[PDB]
């Protein structure tokens, strides 16, 4: 009985790293990685750090293996301040919360997402957060958070609104 | 001439490997304690380059990975061939063809170890990996062997533990993707590596009797007989036609039953089910 | 049994010929300072173990005909004795190797030191340090070589990229 | 069961070719059937066993695929009969 993915990310000078959390799954991570690391984009070295409570399966572990230098994974819960300190939210360039687009109750998923963003804001208010919202009113709920300020960069992507 | 051995000097190779491993540990821990008590980075640049090399992210990386696969198989075959020779012998480097191939293999493995060390994030936990350990106890003995013109078949069976890092190799090359196939290759690699490594250790301890008896407990077991003995043992069959007679062989059997019978009983049915 | 001959302090000539003694141990003979000759002819002694002849200072005549002498390094201390205790030619011609191979039925007195230079020499003080230092030194050299190659390649790539970014 | 016993019978009665057929064990077919039952049942008495290289190789490769087959088939057959 052991935690194989327990560890602390190490900040690298001159290299921006972003943290990805929320709904982490083989398909979602594959789509995010093929969009983020596309050749047509300008050459910028950004280190992706995935934070998720459920340990990855063999397919997801292999997918992380192909992106050996590009990405990193750390098993933890977004709620814990210690886990957030492990992935270096303080030095992170951005934090991205993915969402389960296909869920039994969209309000419950929005509640989990507002949970996660409130946790990140509580640990570190300055950090910029890009999230996905299934319902439009919950975006207005997001605006109620004190540190949710758009000027420095803070984005809520409402899927219903944009669709 | 012939009959080149009358005494034993295994401690040379053993101490060379041991001092390499333990000096690495001491230097790393001393650096840690000394630090505790006090552009974009060229160290970071070389670390990233080595990380790209270790993976099959480039054509040269794929070539390196395929070469690692092939030369691990080749070094295992070399150990198999050399298993028939006596435990200690004297041979000439520039007149024998197997030592030159083994030297080339070990030079490649040393350079690959250097690349892996450069690419590693945590140096301490990299020093304690199984691949690093089998690199510590396999290459320095071969260098000592070529220097002294004297070959001792010692921890060469540890080369079989290089067979474990094969599922990761196939995952780097994008060949191995689905979870079932990854699980199959993992189980097969672990099972066969453990089987062959335990068989090699039994072969070494039986052919070289326990030291406190002045090496008078030789059983003269060929490697295939030791493989068959391990199969019969961890399969729980236990014929009794072949068994370990030395104290060290019996000790390893006692401590290997606990971890090997469970491994067999949990791996073989799962492998059969997955192939089915 | 070791210590069988120990109390016999005044032995001069001991005959063990015509026997089935497969192996003779140094502790079997014990300390026999006055032993002047030994007889071991017509036996099954494959080779004499080291340290057997070291406890017989007065051993001047020795008979070794008709014995399964396996001419290897195991009898290195034996022939060295024969070089300093020459045998009569009639006896010398009968003392031969037995092992099938390169040295078959070759007289033991025909083997010189250079013929057994490949054998295990006593531990030295230079090679003792060389074997201890060969491992870590080679690992450090490999690490430094990989680091230097990576640094050079990365510097070359960066220089090529920043000088030819617009090109 | 019968096919494996027959293969052991043929291999043991005809010693490995590279030894010039000098490794005869002279096992009857019934002895080979008994040996196979003792083996794949994991009992392993050791009074009867294969001594040739080919026989030992086949026994090693048959243990893996036969012990599991015995352990999966015998209880199921007993349950179905009951
Ligand atoms: Mg990294």
The DSSP result for A62-99, as a single string, is HHHHHTTTTEEEEE--SS-HHHHHHTTTTT-S-EEEE-
A44 and chain B in contact, CB less than 8 A: no
> Could you tell me which residues are beta bridge partners of residue A73?
A50
For tokens 């420095």, name the residue. A152
What is the A46 CA–ligand 1 centroid distance (Å)? Answer: 10
Partner residue facing D44 (CB), from B224, B228, B237: B237
Give Cβ neighbours of residue B32 (< 8 Å, ≥ 6 apart): B124
Chains A, B: CB pairs < 8 Å = 44
B93 φ/ψ angles, rounded to the nearest 5 degrees: -70, -50
Output the CA torsion sign for B233, B238, B243, B249.
Answer: positive
B158–C contact, CB cutoff 8 A: no
Q: How many angstroms separate the alpha carbon of residue B57 from the centre of ligand 1? A: 14
Q: D-chain residues within 8 Å CB-CB of B224? A: 53, 56
DSSP-assigned beta bridge partners for residue A61? none
Residue A153 makes CB contacts below 8 A (sequence gap 6+) with A94, A128
A62: nearest CA in chain B?
Answer: B171
Contact in structure between B44 and A14 (CB atoms under 8 Å): yes
Q: Beta strands of C55-150 (E only): which ranges?
A: 61-63
D44/B227 CB distance under 8 A: no
Q: Is B166 helix (H, G, I), strand (E, B) or coil?
A: coil
**B·C CB contacts under 8 A:** 112
CA distance D82 to chain B (A): 25
* Cβ contact B237–D63 (<8 Å): yes
CB distance C126 to B8 below 8 Å: no
With a CB cutoff of 8 Å and minimum separation 6, the contacts of C22 are C44, C45, C46
Distance B49 CA to ligand 1 centre (A): 12
Give DSSP secondary structure letters for B97-130.
HHHHHHHHHHHHHHHHHHHHHHH-S-HHHHHTSH
Say if D and C touch: at least 3 Cβ pairs within 8 Å: no
B118 C-beta neighbours (distance < 10 Å), count: 22
Residues of B in contact with D43 (CB under 8 A): 237
**Ligand 1 center from residue A47 Cα (angstroms):** 7
Write out the two tokens for B11: 């401690």
DSSP letter at C122 equals P
Residues of A in contact with B178 (CB under 8 A): 59
Q: CA of C10, closest CA in chain B: separation in Å?
A: 32
> Under an 8 A CB cutoff, do D42 and B237 touch?
yes
Q: Would you say the C-alpha torsion A13, A19, A25, A31 has a positive or negative sign?
A: negative
> CA B140 from chain center: how many Å?
13
In chain A, the residue whose alpha carbon lies closest to the alpha carbon of B121 is A10
Cα–Cα distance measured from residue A83 to residue A116, given in angstroms and rounded to the nearest whole number: 13
Q: Which residues pair with B152 in a beta bridge?
A: B88
Minimal Cβ distance to B1: which of C116, C123, C153: C116
Residue D13 structure tokens: 């009665």
Q: Does residue A52 sit in helix, strand or coil?
A: strand
Radius of gyration for chain C, computed over Cα atoms and rounded to the nearest angstrom:
29
B239 backbone dihedrals φ, ψ, rounded to 5°: -65, -50
CA C120 to chain B, closest CA, distance in angstroms equals: 7
Which candidate, A52, A41, A115, places its Cα nearest to that of A86? Answer: A52
Resolution of the structure, angstroms: 3.5
- B42 vs C: CB within 8 A: yes
Q: How many C-beta atoms lie closer than 10 Å to residue C3's C-beta?
A: 10
DSSP state of D6: H
Between CA A118 and CA A116 the distance in angstroms is 5
The pairing of beta strand B88-89 with beta strand B151-152: antiparallel
Nearest-neighbour CA in chain B from C85: distance (Å): 23
Q: Taking CB atoms and an 8 Å limit, are A69 and B121 in contact across chains? A: no
CA–CA separation, A125 vs A95, rounded Å?
Answer: 12
Asked if residues B50 and B67 have their Cβ atoms less than 8 Å apart, the reply is no
Tell me the C-alpha distance between C65 and A112, whole Å.
96
Q: What is the whole-number distance in angstroms between the Cα of residue C96 and the centre of ligand 1?
A: 70
Q: Cα–Cα distances in Å, from C38 out to C5, C35, C92?
A: 13, 8, 16
Would you state the structure tokens that stand for residue A99, as one six-digit string?
Answer: 């969402």
Q: How far apart are CA B184 and CA B272, in angstroms?
A: 9
- Judging contact as 3 or more Cβ pairs under 8 Å, the answer for A and D is no
**B118 vs C143: CB contact, 8 Å cut-off?**
yes
DSSP secondary structure letter of residue C52? S
Are the CB atoms for A116 and A21 separated by under 8 Å?
A: yes
Burial of C14 (0-12, 13-18, 19+ CB in 10 A): middle
- Helices B42-54, B59-82: axis angle to 10 degrees equals 60
Residues of D (36-65) whose Cβ lies below 8 Å from B: 39, 42-46, 49, 51, 53, 56, 59-60, 63-65
Task: Find the A9 Cα to ligand 1 centroid distance in Å.
Answer: 8
Q: How far is residue D73 from each of residues B75, D45, D60, D70, D80, measured CA to CA in Å?
A: 41, 22, 20, 5, 11
A98-112 per-residue burial string, b: 16 or more CB within 10 A, e: under 16: bbbeeeeebeebbeb
Closest CA to B75 of B41, B105, B37, B111: B105
What's the B29 CA to ligand 1 centre distance in angstroms?
A: 23
Residue C123's closest CA among B240, B11, B118?
Answer: B11
Q: What is the distance in angstroms between the CA of the first residue and the CA of the last residue of chain C?
A: 91
Find the closest chain A residue to B171 by CA distance.
Answer: A62
A59/B179 Cβ within 8 A:
yes
Q: How many CB atoms lie within 10 A of CB D54?
A: 20
Q: What is each CA distance from B121 to B52, B116, B162, C112, in whole angstroms?
A: 13, 10, 21, 58
Q: Which residue has 């490649």 as its token pair? A: B108
CB atoms within 10 A of CB C155: 13
Residue B208 · residue B87 · CB < 8 Å: yes
Q: Give CA–CA dist C76/C130, Å, rounded.
A: 26
Q: Which residues of B touch A60 (CB under 8 A)?
A: none
Residue in the structure block whose two tokens are 């001792």: B152
Closest partner residue to C118 (CB to CB) among B19, B50, B90 is B90
DSSP D54: H
- Subunits touching B (CB < 8 Å, at least 3 pairs)? A, C, D
Which technique was used to obtain these atomic coordinates? cryo-EM
């Amino acid at each position: 009985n052991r935690k194989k993915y327990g560890g602390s990310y190490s900040a690298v000078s001159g290299r921006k790293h972003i943290v990805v959390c929320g709904h982490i799954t083989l398909e979602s991570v594959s789509n995010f990685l093929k969009d983020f690391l596309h050749k047509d984009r300008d050459d910028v070295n950004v280190e992706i750090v995935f934070l998720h409570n459920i340990s990855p399966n063999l397919e997801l572990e292999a997918l992380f293996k192909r992106h050996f230098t590009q990405v990193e994974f750390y098993q933890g819960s977004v709620l814990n301040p210690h886990d957030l300190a492990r992935v270096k939210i303080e030095s992170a360039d951005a934090c991205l919360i993915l969402a389960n687009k296909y869920c039994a109750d969209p309000d419950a998923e929005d509640a989990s997402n507002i949970m996660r963003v409130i946790s990140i804001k509580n640990y570190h208010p300055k950090i910029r957060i890009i999230t996905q919202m299934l319902q439009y009113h919950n975006k207005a709920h997001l605006l109620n958070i004190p540190s949710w300020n758009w000027k420095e960069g803070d984005d809520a992507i409402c899927l219903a609104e944009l669709k | 001439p012939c009959d080149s051995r009358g005494q034993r000097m295994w401690w040379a190779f053993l101490a060379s490997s041991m001092v390499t491993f333990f000096g690495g540990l001491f230097i790393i821990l001393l650096w840690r304690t000394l630090k505790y008590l006090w552009e974009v980075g060229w160290m970071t640049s070389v670390k990233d380059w080595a990380g790209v090399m270790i993976s099959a992210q480039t054509l040269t990386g794929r070539v390196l990975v395929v070469l690692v696969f092939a030369l691990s198989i080749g070094a295992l075959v070399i150990y198999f061939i050399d298993s028939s020779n006596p435990i200690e012998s004297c041979q000439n480097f520039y007149k024998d063809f197997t030592l030159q191939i083994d030297m080339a293999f070990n030079v490649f493995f040393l350079l690959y170890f250097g690349l892996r060390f450069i690419a590693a994030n945590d140096k301490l936990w990299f020093w304690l990996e199984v691949n690093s350990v089998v690199d510590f106890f396999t290459v320095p003995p071969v260098f000592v062997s070529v220097y002294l013109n004297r070959s001792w078949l010692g921890l060469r069976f540890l080369r079989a533990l290089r067979l474990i890092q094969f599922s990761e190799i196939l995952q780097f090359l994008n060949i191995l993707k689905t979870s079932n196939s990854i699980k199959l290759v993992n189980l097969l690699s672990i099972f066969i590596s453990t089987w062959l490594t335990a068989a090699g250790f039994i072969h070494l301890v039986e052919n070289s009797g326990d030291p406190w008896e002045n090496f008078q407990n030789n059983q003269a077991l060929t490697y295939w007989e030791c493989v068959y003995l391990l199969m019969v043992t961890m399969s729980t069959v236990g014929y009794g036609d072949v068994y370990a007679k030395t104290t060290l062989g019996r000790l390893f059997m006692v401590f290997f039953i606990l971890g090997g019978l469970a491994m067999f009983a949990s791996y073989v049915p799962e492998i059969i089910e997955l192939i089915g | 049994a070791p210590g069988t001959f120990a109390p016999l302090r005044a032995l001069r000539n001991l005959s063990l010929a015509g026997n089935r003694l497969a192996r003779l141990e140094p502790a079997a003979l014990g300390a026999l300072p006055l032993l002047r000759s030994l007889s071991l002819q017509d036996n099954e002694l494959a080779a004499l173990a080291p340290g057997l002849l070291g406890r017989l200072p007065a051993l001047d005549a020795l008979h070794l005909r008709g014995n399964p002498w396996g001419c290897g390094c195991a009898l290195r201390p034996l022939c060295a004795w024969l070089r300093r205790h020459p045998l009569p030619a009639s006896e010398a011609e009968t003392v031969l190797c037995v092992w099938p191979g390169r040295l078959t039925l070759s007289p033991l007195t025909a083997f010189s030191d250079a013929a057994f230079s490949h054998c295990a020499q006593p531990l030295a003080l230079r090679d003792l340090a060389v074997v201890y230092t060969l491992g870590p030194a080679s690992f450090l050299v490999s690490l430094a070589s990989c680091l230097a190659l990576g640094s050079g390649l990365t510097a070359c790539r960066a220089r090529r990229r920043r000088l030819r970014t617009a090109a």
